[PDB]
């Protein structure tokens, strides 16, 4: 249990080994959640990458934010997947926030502090509590089957998970860096382990 | 009668069922009005959508703001229709305000807080008091004949209707979120009912 505030996970090599298994006390399968994270990578104009990965023994990509190469942010829940069109991707750190829910399938994918229009996904679906959250790898199984092409080779931090859809003002505040209580997983109270050549050093973004 | 401030209607699926019938105490056929609403959707670059719909037993689109696909905002009054050219539509929430009047046919279509040049429409025409205001559907009848292609699949809120053309400073204030008295229909004092898969949750836009 380490506080990662003002620090980010160093992802500098494309590989199937670089990753970080983020532990979470989550026990009840999530009927609603929100993952916020400030990441930064220049692979946006070279290939896609797993921005954030969440697996289950049933679903390898139970919750996964990925850079659809040449199309923006593909966010997936429970295998099913939706896509947020990024008209132009800039070389600059970006703070994403996706807020899928299991009733209305609603996803407030706040990007760089700005909102992406809510779109249905996996409506009335329960996210498996047991998870092998990982970064840098689109896991095709529970923390396994990693691919460099699908890997993040930049850096990422502020990874916070809530069991509820944060209010838009709350998401704004997460962007502003104010306090929060990410019950499911919290960057400032983050339990995790590192595998491969992933380091960890002070986050670039403000 | 529910206050929808800081909340928006969740429109996440293209369908002819998703809609919200907004009740209004309006009794005298409107010789002048103004609808302001902050909506957000990415269909702007995929197809058109009914941003706001207002029907009568005589006219199905008695008052209707729609996204003319590849041409901006088509605003219609009493069947007749005018079009505001949007040179480029950005993925971002926008606050529209149209102000048709029955004497000069004038329409101050304030968009994103900025004005669209006044243009005549339906001059000397009375808007039917009885209405089946709906969102997400270009109704070809009184609250009926909905089409997914003509449907809004984003979200919308701050839907306020006045029986008078608000002063431009007043419209600015509506954009700023200050207080107002939308006699005809008021988001903060909104009477309505929901049909289809439309949810309602905290509005994304500031």
């Amino acid at each position, epitope marked *: 249990q380490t506080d990662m505030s003002r620090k980010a996970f160093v992802f500098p090599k494309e590989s199937d080994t670089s990753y970080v298994s983020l532990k979470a006390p989550l026990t009840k399968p999530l009927k609603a959640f929100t993952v916020c994270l400030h990441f930064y990578t220049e692979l946006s104009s070279t290939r896609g990458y797993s921005i954030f990965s969440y697996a289950t023994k049933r679903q390898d990509n139970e919750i996964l934010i990925f850079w659809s190469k040449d199309i923006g942010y593909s966010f997936t829940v429970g295998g099913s997947e939706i896509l947020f069109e990024v008209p132009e991707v800039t070389v600059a750190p970006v703070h994403i926030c996706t807020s899928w829910e299991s009733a209305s399938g609603i996803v407030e994918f706040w990007v760089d502090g700005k909102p992406r229009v809510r779109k249905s996904l996996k409506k009335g679906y329960t996210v498996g509590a047991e998870a092998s959250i990982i970064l840098g790898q*689109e896991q095709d199984s529970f923390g396994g089957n990693f691919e460099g092409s699908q890997s993040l080779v930049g850096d990422i931090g502020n990874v916070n998970m809530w069991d509820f859809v944060l209010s838009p003002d709350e998401i704004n505040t997460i962007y502003l860096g104010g306090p929060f209580s990410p019950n499911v997983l919290n960057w400032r109270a983050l339990k995790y382990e590192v595998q491969g050549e992933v380091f960890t050093k002070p986050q670039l973004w403000p | 009668q529910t206050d929808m401030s800081r909340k928006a209607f969740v429109f996440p699926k293209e369908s002819d069922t998703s809609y919200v019938s907004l009740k209004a105490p309006l009794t005298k056929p409107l010789k002048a009005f103004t609808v302001c609403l902050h909506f957000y959707t990415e269909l702007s670059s995929t197809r058109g959508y009914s941003i706001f719909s207002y029907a009568t037993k005589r006219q199905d689109n008695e008052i209707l703001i729609f996204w003319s696909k590849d041409i901006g905002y088509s605003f219609t009054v009493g069947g007749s229709e005018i079009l505001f050219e949007v040179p480029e539509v950005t993925v971002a929430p926008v606050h529209i305000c149209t102000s048709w009047e029955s004497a000069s046919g004038i329409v101050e279509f304030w968009v994103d807080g900025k004005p669209r040049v006044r243009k005549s429409l339906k001059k000397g025409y009375t808007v039917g008091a009885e209405a089946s205001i709906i969102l997400g559907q270009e109704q070809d009848s009184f609250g009926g004949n909905f089409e997914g292609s003509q449907s809004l699949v984003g979200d919308i809120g701050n839907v306020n209707m006045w029986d008078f053309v608000l002063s431009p400073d007043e419209i600015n204030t509506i954009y700023l979120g200050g207080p107002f008295s939308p006699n005809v229909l008021n988001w903060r004092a909104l009477k309505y009912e929901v049909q289809g898969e439309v949810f309602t949750k905290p509005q994304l836009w500031p």
Partner: nanobody
Amino acid sequence: HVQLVESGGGLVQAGGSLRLSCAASRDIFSRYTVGWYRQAPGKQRDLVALITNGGSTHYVDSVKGRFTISRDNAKNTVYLQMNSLKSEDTAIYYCNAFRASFDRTPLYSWGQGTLVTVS
């Protein structure tokens, strides 16, 4: 056995509309992010468009607005409405089903395609 249905093709005068079908055995397309590729003669196996499992869709710049791909989950018959078919569009359209949206290049199950002639 997958045998992506390739139908709804034929001859259409340029800038018209034609409904391409994409039916799936069982419910497979539910997990697949299915996509239409244009294998035009002397041309590539490039994707004209694609649609995510959830329902969101993308169309390549050359096809922006040109066509609209939707997921028909009732029978796995994802439909593709082609509007304003310019001559370039003339090609054989391969409706393939890869699994997730990021991995456009993989195709897994392969079909036969449907011809399109823009006159």
